[PDB]
Amino acid sequence: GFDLNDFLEQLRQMKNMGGXXXXXXXXXXXXXXXXXXXXXXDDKVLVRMEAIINSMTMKERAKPEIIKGSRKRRIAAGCGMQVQDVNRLLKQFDDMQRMMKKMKKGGXXXXXXXXXXXXXXXXXXX
Amino acid sequence: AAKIRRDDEVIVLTGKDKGKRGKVKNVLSSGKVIVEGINLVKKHQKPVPALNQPGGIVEKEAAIQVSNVAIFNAATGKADRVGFRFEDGKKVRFFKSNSETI
């Protein structure tokens, strides 16, 4: 299935090649709707991600749903960061579990095409 | 005929800021003004990824009723009240006490 093992290797294979100026120029439809400068700090944030996924025991990665308050104190202490950042990293991983299970069920073309860019009313940004 | 305007230096008569002085950013229609260094509130902001807005407690400046601020006389060092006369053919503001133009 999809774990923080494959997420570990996803983000450590993606911390080699990952950049925000090379990947905000490889899509013309998503850099015109949401702002082109909301991309990322790739080295900071992917070395953060790899740090936080190094702070985990291996069945905490292969079974991400058993991570609770004490586990996040221990992870946030391990790499020298805030419990909230580990919260939002397990958030990001949750979204990617959503997306790759959706890519598992739906054929690659019907889950990459039905992908939607979204605003709260037709007026720009609000 | 509007007494308090943008960029006037004012002094605050009422509230937690009573006695403090500052510079007007802008005015609002409801008779509220927003003054520099005045009436800070601590506001909680849910982090917004589209605007790259971090979260956290932002100290912001909250509108204050324009009745509560007085136009600051720099000459006298006192709060003043304002009036209108016609100099040239133009409508102009002055301080009531020393009756000098602004």
Binding site: Q10, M14, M17, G18, X20, X23, X24, X26, X27, X30, X34, X38, X39, X40, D42, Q92, D95, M96, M99, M103, X108, X112, X115 | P49, A50
Partner: peptide, 18 residues
């Protein structure tokens, strides 16, 4: 390929606007 471009594109990017 196709699953590496569908990986990386919406990974880097859909981690950006969300």
């Amino acid at each position: 390929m196709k699953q590496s471009t569908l990986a990386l594109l919406l990974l880097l990017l859909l981690l950006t606007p969300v």
